[PDB]
Design a protein around this ligand. Structure first.
Ligand SMILES: Nc1ncnc2c1ncn2[C@@H]1O[C@H](COP(=O)(O)OP(=O)(O)OP(=O)(O)O)[C@@H](O)[C@H]1O
Ligand SMILES: [Ca+2]
Ligand SMILES: [Ca+2]
Ligand SMILES: [Ca+2]
Ligand SMILES: [Mg+2]
Ligand SMILES: [Mg+2]
Ligand SMILES: [Mg+2]
Ligand SMILES: [Mg+2]
Length: 439
């Protein structure tokens, strides 16, 4: 597209907004930028010629714009943006700008949880094929930074927020991995509204990869000829268990024993299936995509086995900051002895009820900590202990573990009551797992 001579205003001075600034500067357009934070991090990366306004939005800048480029972190519903749209001012986001310029096929991945794992996995499948693939859309590598005429394939992780401002995406393959109660703040009309944002990803997609086990991932008008499904018990791509073994199965044919993979957990096996369905639909060779499933290490803090010693697996699932993540970790969970389950932190007023139906059984112990520990111990008081901190809980369980056991940090809560971020929490869990379980 051609932006010469336009009055362009960018909202957000994070990495995403900075990538938008770079995009317009590379095209000879000097945009204006604003951020409601007084001193956003990106401020001191800006060139001198870019006018900037911080500490709030600048309504007259917005109302004079030819094009508003909104960070995903501000709502289309914010009064200033509603006022601009009422005036007929075009509002887009960075993904919309990307889609207008992308000259290679796009694989597009959204969902409440698992996006980063599936996105990275599809990227590995492309790399195994020798494809110069560009992988991004997370806050840490914004899509506009991927744009390059040498790129042969784009793999984008897309949030519901980015999708709300995107209209030009024509994915060669797209998925909604799952939809669970999250981002409730931004979706005042509930789960079907949050869903409608994610459903935009299928607009003009050539192939829709849907979750057979989550009907909210189906396209808005229902299943159609574009749809390929992945699931646990059935679907085009599904899981097969027998003789104590598990296989990935595609259209009636086993394709891989999961013992060749390095990921653990049924939900990561379904992530593998979704990734393979997307890669297949994108035209990547099956052989190299299966090879990627055997080399993919997984991402830190996502159901990550950090220690396996003396028959005890220690699993860092610190990135399970919400209930749907932990529920997925407990569903179909394979443990031969006792599960020692670490829950706690700032639960953000979540309903933890869903976790209850997994915590019966003679082989479960709960260790609950942080701000909301008491709520979590309430799930099943008989098998629960409550401490202030994760380290205290780990010291409580470490002398009790036996071969066959699993120690799972799947907190279902944010970490900010006691840690700088979930990465520090996961890193601390790994340090203590090795201190207490390695020797
Ligand atoms: N298919 C899945 N369903 C539910 N939870 C999952 C699934 N795959 C992974 N998880 C868990 O969800 C948490 C987040 O994983 P991941 O970082 O891949 O998600 P995401 O969608 O990228 O998240 P974000 O919205 O923060 O970008 C981790 O606990 C991971 O184990
Ligand atoms: Ca802002
Ligand atoms: Ca206590
Ligand atoms: Ca956190
Ligand atoms: Mg001024
Ligand atoms: Mg999210
Ligand atoms: Mg992510
Ligand atoms: Mg079902």
């Amino acid at each position: 597209a051609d932006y010469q001579g336009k009055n362009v205003v960018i909202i957000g001075l994070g990495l995403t907004g900075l990538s938008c600034v770079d995009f317009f500067l590379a095209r000879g357009v000097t945009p204006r930028v604003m951020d409601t934070r007084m001193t956003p991090p990106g401020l001191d990366k800006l060139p001198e010629a870019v006018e900037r306004h911080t500490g709030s939005l600048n309504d007259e800048w917005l109302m004079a714009a030819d094009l508003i480029v909104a960070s995903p972190g501000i709502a289309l519903a914010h009064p200033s943006l509603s006022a601009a749209a009422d005036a007929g001012i075009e509002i887009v986001g960075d993904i919309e700008l990307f889609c207008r310029e992308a000259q290679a096929p796009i694989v597009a991945i959204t969902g409440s949880n698992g996006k980063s794992t599936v996105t990275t996995l599809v990227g590995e499948m492309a790399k195994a094929a020798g494809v110069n693939v560009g992988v991004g859309g997370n806050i840490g590598l914004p899509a506009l930074m991927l744009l390059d005429d040498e790129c042969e394939l784009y793999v984008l992780e897309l949030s519901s927020f980015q999708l709300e401002t995107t209209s030009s995406l024509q994915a060669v393959a797209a998925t909604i991995l799952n939809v669970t109660e999250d981002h409730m703040d931004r979706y005042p009309f509930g789960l079907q509204q949050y869903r409608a944002a994610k459903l935009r990803i299928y607009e003009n997609a050539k192939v829709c990869v849907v979750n057979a086990d989550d009907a909210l991932t189906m396209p808005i008008r229902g299943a159609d000829e574009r749809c390929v499904s992945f699931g646990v018990n059935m679907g085009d791509y599904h899981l097969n268990h027998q003789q104590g073994e598990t296989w990935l199965r595609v259209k009636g044919e086993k394709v891989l024993n999961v013992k060749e993979m390095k990921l653990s957990g049924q939900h990561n096996y379904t992530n593998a299936l979704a990734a393979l369905a997307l890669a297949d639909a994108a035209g990547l060779p099956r052989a190299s995509s299966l090879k990627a499933l055997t080399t993919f290490t997984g991402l830190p803090h996502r159901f990550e086995v950090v220690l396996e010693h003396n028959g005890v697996r220690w699993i860092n699932d610190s990135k399970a900051t919400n209930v749907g993540s932990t529920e997925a970790a407990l569903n179909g969970l394979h443990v031969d002895g006792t599960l020692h389950l670490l829950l706690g932190g700032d639960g953000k007023s979540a309903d933890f009820s869903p976790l209850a139906r997994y915590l019966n059984g003679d082989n479960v112990r709960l260790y609950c900590f942080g701000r909301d520990g008491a709520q979590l111990a309430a799930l099943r008081p008989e098998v629960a202990e409550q401490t202030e901190t994760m380290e205290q809980a780990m010291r409580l369980l470490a002398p009790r573990v036996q071969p066959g056991d699993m120690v799972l940090l799947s907190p279902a809560c944010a970490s900010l009551d006691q840690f700088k971020n979930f990465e520090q929490r996961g890193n601390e869990f790994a340090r203590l797992a090795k201190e207490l379980g390695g020797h």
